[PDB]
Every structure is written in structure tokens, then in C-alpha cells.
Amino acid sequence: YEHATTMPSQAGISYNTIVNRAGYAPLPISITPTKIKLIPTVNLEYVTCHYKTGMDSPAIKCCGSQECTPTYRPDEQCKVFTGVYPFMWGGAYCFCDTENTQVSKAYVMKSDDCLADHAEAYKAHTASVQAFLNITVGEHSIVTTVYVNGETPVNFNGVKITAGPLSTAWTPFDRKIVQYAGEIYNYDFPEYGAGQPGAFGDIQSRTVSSSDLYANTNLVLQRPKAGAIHVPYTQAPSGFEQWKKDKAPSLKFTAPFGCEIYTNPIRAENCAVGSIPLAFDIPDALFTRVSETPTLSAAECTLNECVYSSDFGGIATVKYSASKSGKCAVHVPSGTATLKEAAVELTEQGSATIHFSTANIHPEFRLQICTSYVTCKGDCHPPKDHIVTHPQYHAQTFTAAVSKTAWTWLTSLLGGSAVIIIIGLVLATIVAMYVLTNQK
Amino acid sequence: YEHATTMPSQAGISYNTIVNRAGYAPLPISITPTKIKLIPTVNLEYVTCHYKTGMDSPAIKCCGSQECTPTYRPDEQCKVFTGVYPFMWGGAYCFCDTENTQVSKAYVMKSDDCLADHAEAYKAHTASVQAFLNITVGEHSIVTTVYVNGETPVNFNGVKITAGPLSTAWTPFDRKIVQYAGEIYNYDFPEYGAGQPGAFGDIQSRTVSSSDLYANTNLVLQRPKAGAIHVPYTQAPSGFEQWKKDKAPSLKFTAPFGCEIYTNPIRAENCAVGSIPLAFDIPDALFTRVSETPTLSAAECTLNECVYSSDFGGIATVKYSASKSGKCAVHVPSGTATLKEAAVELTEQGSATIHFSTANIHPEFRLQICTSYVTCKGDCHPPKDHIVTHPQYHAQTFTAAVSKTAWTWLTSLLGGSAVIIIIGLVLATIVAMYVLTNQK
């Protein structure tokens, strides 16, 4: 037997349904999502951190001249200044007043703290969805991680369940993300080998331990101060620190649908978007006979009180005269009310208490018990608190909260609109016939 | 300056271009794709090998009874066969004619050779195109790997180059692929936990070293033969061996467009499909004035010998009277002839030989020397050999091979009919005017 349903993607809220074969005991099914994870496929582009302008000692040649060698280091600048007269603590370092040269080199590498303070630039695509589910089919329970691709099955006690695919392809991440300090930022970082000075990714390394290091920090060399041994340089400040000075709140605080953004692996959790289409395959063995389950006779629903709040604010009592005791499944086929429980203990005679949540002013829901269907009615009152801290436990309709008196006005005004028109047409036809009869 | 072009995705065949500025020396471009890789993203969800049906030693009890231990191993089956009379090498085992019990249980494990002789099932999507290019711009050369996403740039001598994205999204790998013995198969394997007996994936392990194993092989325990201590079982023959028996040739032999399917990483190399858009950003320092390059005047192109073969069958010469010697670029802006080279040495006066490949019988191609432009015209003969081992080095048009006699026949059959129609219309108008004039 193949069953199909559609459970909204909302963690922490149960989803109870019932499988009704033509002549067999109903089968209760409950799916409880404890966590829904969306994990994009991310590949590392590069890693950025503060740079260090490590720079070689200035080689001074007296009374002569020097030439520059490349040495092939990231963003290396080498320059020879002629006419220096360097000084030390001991006195004048050189014995020629002029024609002394000083060659100064300045390169850039990753800082000493790049092994801990670095931001990784990822590219994300083709997100994959997983869900932690507590499933209960016909008293057969399981707690398992299901992949929400519409093909991977979770199987237990002969029952197969295939979840998904998620009705939406929306993902909180763009095509380029930046992960720093265990916090995902949605940033459009420069491509590798295309970084710019003063901005994110001015220095780039393919990996934290990688030997290669692109570096474009606008490094230039200035002439040393007269009578001083040092290598002056003026380059644009670190792009990593500048990015951190203003980077906007992370995806923890800006992701739509209230997603929770986590790292290792980069994932989103409890995104309240879309619905998961569930497909059950229940073997015929689990469908027992009607005589084995209690059979209900002479049952009626009484609505003790209803308050159409977000939580289970409504209650009902069913007067029942059952064939025997035992567990009995309860359900609401309509979408006008959702029960807290999908089962109830049932005695030979008595009354059963059922908690439910609804959004209707005047409920009219055709509740199902063991095999019988009892219509349950009543009135609801507004909840006593304006703002709550939990999501909505039901689903509303466009005509849910109209209430009887608004129906009365809308019908009287629209019906009265039609009645007067009908009277006008009747009078017109009558007088037309009368005039035609007046023709001699 | 930004120069955008396109290049056919055909490995080995050099693609030559000339970029012309307003009044500066033309700049040659030469791109040689040595190798083009298409690398899909693959997720491994299980591996499969030959199974080994393990089984415990039978537990024999004389004048007694035993109970089945709960199953805790892959496909474990346990049965307590009663009324056995085991018979060891040292006579009968039990002194008890009947009410002797034998517990026999069996289960499935991976074979001892699953570390090497296994096939791993991947899911493939979102192929990532890569290329290996020789780029030559203005006597500046670089051999590099270019990611054919339309954003990653390659830098050399101040020149930016961005290739891609590939004009087509075609990939030879299906959604589900299988790697075995270095060969890739487009196999629609069952999902993990859905393996069936006697078919590929009857036993499934998430990874090679994983401690989990899903086994479904119809293992069934049979009653032991009288007087024998052994565990008789029955199960479907291994699905891995059956798949190996009839699995069809791998993608290496069936992939369209002549792709070469390689492994580690799973990739398709040298597919003759699609085109790669190229975008060059050339710094303005590379362009030099026409005065520096050797300008040319008073030249004409004579076609020595043309054969429209796949290779460079056409040979022509240009009689040049250059202002000075040096390098000079040559290119055909049209597609009716592709030159062998994009550079030639010019003396003060002389003749320079050019090799070109054409697909048309009468090449009226508008050759472009570095400064002067020469129209080259002639006739061609068909090639001698029906089959060659080279790909086509030129691009053919729909009207390339129409020749002159067919043009005359077409411009006769069409055209003469239009002339006859014009004559008929003229005669009709003339006689209509004549008959209208004769009203009086």
C-alpha cells in the first residue's frame, strides 16, 4: 500500500496523519522533525589573513655601487638609493661622503597568526537537505536522519519512507561566502589572483599551509632619512582588518525565514520555507482487521471551550460506547483543526478528552475516531495574550475567521441585492405581458 | 583596451587572432589548448564488492533444546534444527537418538579483497570545465591552467585573460555513475539501503573503512544433512560478480564527442563540443606605434598551389617591399582560410611564403599583412586521400565548395527565368497600353 502526504518544513512541530484502508483498522502515522539541515556544497577558493611586511636588511656599500636582484617573493620591491651617509651608535658608518649606495628590499608574507586568525572564501552551490525525524507508524517507532532527496529511502519494519525533494530550491547562501571566526558572511570576494590593495583578499593563499601567496598591497619604497639605517615603505593598510572594521551582520542575523547558520559543516538549520513531500510504502501485513481494533458506537462531540490561540487552546469531549478497550486512532481529515495526539486509550463506556488547535471562530470539523466520524461544532473566543513565543500549531484559511454574524450581513446585503433585482425583472416581465395583452 | 573573442574547444589546434588598434601596431594573439578537462562534482554514497557469507560453528545440544540469539549482524539468519544426530570423525557426537538440537546461524560480510576489488558509486553534477593553454600575446608567452568559469582571471605581463563559461553545459556523466577498476559507467544503481539480491549493490557500505554494511542477498538456512555437522545455506549469487559479467563498455568507449574519460579525479578530457569565450584586458603600454613595426607597401598575393585538404594544403607567397626588416603579423579576418602561423620575418624587399588551410575551391581571401592588406585569389584541387588521421583545421561555409561552373549554372537557371518573366510582363503592359490607346 502506497501512501503520500506533504509535511510542512517546521522543526519541533509534529505532523499526525492516518491511513484508512477500505475495510481495515486505521493506521496512525506521526512525523516529528527535530532538525532540518541544508548543507551547500562548498569548495575552498583561498584563505585571507593579516599580512606581515617582512623586509630584508638594507645592504650598504661604501664608495661603490650595487645592483638589484628579484629574488621572486610576493609583492617584492627592491630599490637602491645613492648618496646615503648612514650612522650607527658607534658613529658614522661609512667613510665616503657621497657615492655610497644602500639597497633595500621589502616583501610581504602571511602574519604569524594566520594559522588561527584567517577567513576562508568558499563557493556554494547545489545545497543538499537532511532532516532528523522521529517517525511512528503503527506503534513502530524510529529516530533517524533522512536525506530529503526524493529517492533515498529510510526503511524499518518493512515500511519504506522517501522524503523530499524540498518544494523550494531557496538557499540562504549566495554563490560566494566568506567564513570567519566560525560565522558565515555573504560576501562577494575577489577571485584568486585578482585581489586589490586595501580590501578583502589583498593577499591570498590557496590553503592555510600552501606555499603560494598572491599579494597585491600597493607596496612602494621611500628614500631613507639622511643618517639613518632603515627601510621606509608606504603600502595600503591591511584589507582583512579593513573588512573586519565594517562587514555587516553575519547570516546568523540576516538570513531570511529565521535560518540558524552553523559552521563545520557550513549549514543552515530550521529554515521555515517549503514543505517536504513524504511517500510511505506500508506492506499489507501491518493492516490488521477491524474486529481486532475497538469499534465505536453512539459517540458525540461536545466542545467544552475553544480559544483559537496559536497553541492547543481548544478541548473537546466525546461520549462513546465502544465495543472494547484499547488504543484508538483519532484524526481530523479537514484542515480546520489539528489534534495534539493521534491516539487515545478507550474503554467500553465513557468520555474521551481530546486537545486540538484551530483558527476558526465557529469550528465545524468532522473528527474521526476508531471507525466512526463525529461532527464537532461550537464557538471560539480570542486568546488572552497578544504576543506568544511559539509558532502557529495549525493552518488558517481565508474564510476561517468570518464568524456567523459577518456571514449574516454579507448574505443579507448580497442576497438582498439579488432579491430586489429579481423583483424588478419579475415586475418588468409582468407589465410587458400585460401590455401585450392590452393589444386589442 | 578590452578584446572579446571566441575559441573552438578543440585540443591541439592553435587558434590565432590579430587585434588592431586605431593607429598602433597590430598585436598577435595565439592560444593553444593542449588539454581540456571537464570535472564533475561527485559525492560517494556507497561502495560494493563481493560478499562473504560468514557463519558460526553449529551449537549442538544432546537431549536438549536451544533458543535463537537476536540478530545483530548484516543479513543474519538463525534457526534451531531439532532431531539432529551429528556424527563427528570420532563416531557419533551425541548418545541421544532424538531431541538433539543444532543452532546454525549465518550472516554476510565484505570479502577480504574489498580494499582493492570494489566499485564505488558516485552522484555527479555541476561539471567544472578546465583548460591547459599556451597563451602568446605580443611575444609574451605563458603556459597555464585556466578555469573556464567566466570570472577567474589569469595575469601575465599586466594582461588579464578570462575564459568561459563554456557555450554548452553538456556532460558525458549521468546523475549516477560507478567507478570500477579505473573505468566509469553510467549506471543507475539503487540508493543506499535499497539494494536487491543478485544485483549490483546487494551489499552496501558507506565507505571502504566504514563499519556499517547493508546486506540483502536472500540468505536462507536449510536443514543439515543427516549425520553431518555443517551449516547449509542458500542465497542469491553475488550481484557484484553478475554486474561485472554484463556491464557494457565504460564511458571510455561510448562517450559522445570523442571524450576521454579519466579517473582520479573523475573527469572527461578533450571533448570536441562547445566554444570557449575569451576576454583579454591588454594594458595600453603593449600597443606600439606603426612607425616602430616595419610598415609595408606595394605587395600582392599569388597562390602557388592550393589543395583543400584538412591539413595546411595551400601555399602562397606575397611579394613585399617593406620599409625595414623585422617581425610582421599575418592573419585572415574571414573564415575561408586559416593560416599556419601568425608571424613572419620581412626583409627590405623580397617574397614571403605563407601556408594556409582552406575549404573552398576558389579562395578569394582577404589576407592582412601587419600594415598592408592583400587580396589573394586562385584555384584549388581536391585532396588525394579519402581518410586522414587529422581533424579539420579549417571552418567550412555552406557555399564554400560551390565552384564556378555551378555558379554559372545557377545564375543561368535562376535569373534567365526572371528575365523571361520580365519580358512577359513588359509585353503584357505594352499590349495593354496599345489596346487602351485604340479606344479611338
Ligand SMILES: *[C@@H]1O[C@H](CO)[C@@H](O)[C@H](O)[C@H]1NC(C)=O
Ligand atoms: C522523538 O525523538 C526525539 C529525540 O529522541 C525527541 O526529542 C522527541 O520528543 C520524540 N518525539 C516523539 C513524538 O516521541
Ligand SMILES: *[C@@H]1O[C@H](CO)[C@@H](O)[C@H](O)[C@H]1NC(C)=O
Ligand atoms: C604548447 O605547450 C606544450 C607544452 O609545453 C608544447 O609542447 C607546445 O609546443 C606549445 N605550443 C606552442 C605553440 O607554444
